């Protein structure tokens, strides 16, 4: 029953500015409180922000303090984050998620109802939200050409593709066995680039061909490059 | 801004056994003021608790936690399949609320020795003029692994990355990539290329090597 | 008339959030076992919450015997700002007072200063006079 759908993402520029929503169903939304957690590359669980079920506490991670905004919208049910002044540090996937339906003063009164944002038992699915400067544009493919432990190694290199993510298959995807590929690493540039191998008999590479199969889909592309030895 | 330093970063245990965290708090929590929760790859996290152990809705009586002050622990009595991820603690006793870094739960085998395989630049790659060496350390227990990149047996740095995949599901083993790059003129202009690998299942460093052009 | 009769009877929050021409106001309100408040909603015209500093406002007589014994001695010569129940008593004695009738007894239900209380809007006896109130003001000629 309990649902949490984000919405809003996309590429900005730094100096930009997004704004994000999260509908909640289900339960008595008034009551509850509601926060936002992010995830880097790479990083943990980093508190961002928190407010309560009408908006008029809101409270921020020091690390963003100022730069965002939040905001909810109790009479169509919506909660918001407006986020300016984006930097590329900032650059994670954005959960929403449900906070307490109570909380406590400072002389202990528990009032129920009147939720807040202390933990979160709910999480949406997450959308992401890539703050960088560099301009869309589909990768460049390079083969990586081939022996240990009586078999060879071959792969496709998948390098300077912007922005995330790329997928890849094997001979329209029937080719699973001994495929592994690797976590996209950012450059200098700020460009991605990774690796695409597969494990295969070395006595196999005469007869059959491989090609690898390279998907962009920001950029809408398509790559296919054959590996000769 | 209250710091978290939880440990250790990752556990290595087997179905059945019991698991117990650690997170370190800066300063003084009120030891009713903590949550733990679940993260597995491609999922949302999942609370599993609040009120330092009060039960969060769903999560059975066999996961239990505790502590106080500044250091605060959390026991997973016997561990099972769908156990194995990411757990990261959470303080809310003072603004700003921060998560510790996370601890990993990671399926155990037994210790597999990498297989290396170095990967000089490809013709095509240079000719456009950048220079790519790859490094494939493949199918290899524990994670920890030192790649190290020398050119001319000179050692390298700034200028070369790493990248490890998700934990296998078919084998339970790892797999990482360490990526050498390099400008075209100063490629041509020297011989030695080289990865060194470290690791625990070695009886001692393995190094592969080739000279350009050869 | 020669004697008339007056019965009186009058019942009489913190912070009210007020939204949406009538108020769809919520608040905390107490139940339970002296800790837990269950956030209750109302209703109120603008003409019963008064403002104070978002947007949260409260409620606004404030004195309860004084409401319904009002009540009373007004009920009783057939008759039917705010911040004051002393003035509108000598308000209500004013009335009663230009038709003749002279207030027999009152009954009520810190004592001796709120009869002296009343006493100085009645200007009646000490030895006549003596959160929920009922309350009965006779009226007497004089
Ligand atoms: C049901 O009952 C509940 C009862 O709680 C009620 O909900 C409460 O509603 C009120 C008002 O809507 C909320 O009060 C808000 O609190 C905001 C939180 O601010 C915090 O941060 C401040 C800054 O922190 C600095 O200092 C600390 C010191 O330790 C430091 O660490 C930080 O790093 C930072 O440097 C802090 O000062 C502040 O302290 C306030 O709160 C305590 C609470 O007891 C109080 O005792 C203090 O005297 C002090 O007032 C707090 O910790 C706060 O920002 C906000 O105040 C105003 O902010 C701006 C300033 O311009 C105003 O424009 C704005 O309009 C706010 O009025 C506000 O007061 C309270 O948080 C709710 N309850 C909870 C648990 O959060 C419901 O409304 C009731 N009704 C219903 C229907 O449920
Ligand atoms: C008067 O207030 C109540 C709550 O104080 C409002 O009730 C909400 O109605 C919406 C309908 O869209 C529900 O989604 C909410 O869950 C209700 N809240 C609660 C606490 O039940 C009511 O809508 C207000 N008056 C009007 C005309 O809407």
Redesign the interface.
Known sequence: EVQLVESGGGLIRPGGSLRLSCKGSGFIFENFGFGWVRQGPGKGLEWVSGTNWNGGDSRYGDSVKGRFTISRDNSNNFVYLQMNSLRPEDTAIYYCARGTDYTIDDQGIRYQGSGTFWYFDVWGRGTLVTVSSASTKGPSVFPLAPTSGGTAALGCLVKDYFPEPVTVSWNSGALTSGVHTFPAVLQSSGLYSLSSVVTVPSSSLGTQTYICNVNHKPSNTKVDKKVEP | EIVLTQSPDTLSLSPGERATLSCRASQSVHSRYFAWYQHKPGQPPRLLIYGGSTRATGIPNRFSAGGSGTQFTLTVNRLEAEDFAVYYCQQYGRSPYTFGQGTKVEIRRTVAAPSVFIFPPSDEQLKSGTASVVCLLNNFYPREAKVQWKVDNALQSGNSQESVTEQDSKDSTYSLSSTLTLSKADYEKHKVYACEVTHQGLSSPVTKSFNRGE | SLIRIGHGFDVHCVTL?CTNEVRNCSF?MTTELR?????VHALFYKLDIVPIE?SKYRLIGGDVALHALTDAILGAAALGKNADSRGLLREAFRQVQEKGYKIGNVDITHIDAMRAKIAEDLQCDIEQVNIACEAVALLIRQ
Do not use: E, L, P, R
């Not at chain 3, 800790?35 to 956030?39: A, M």
């Open positions: 959030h905390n800790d837990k408040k269950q956030k978002n």
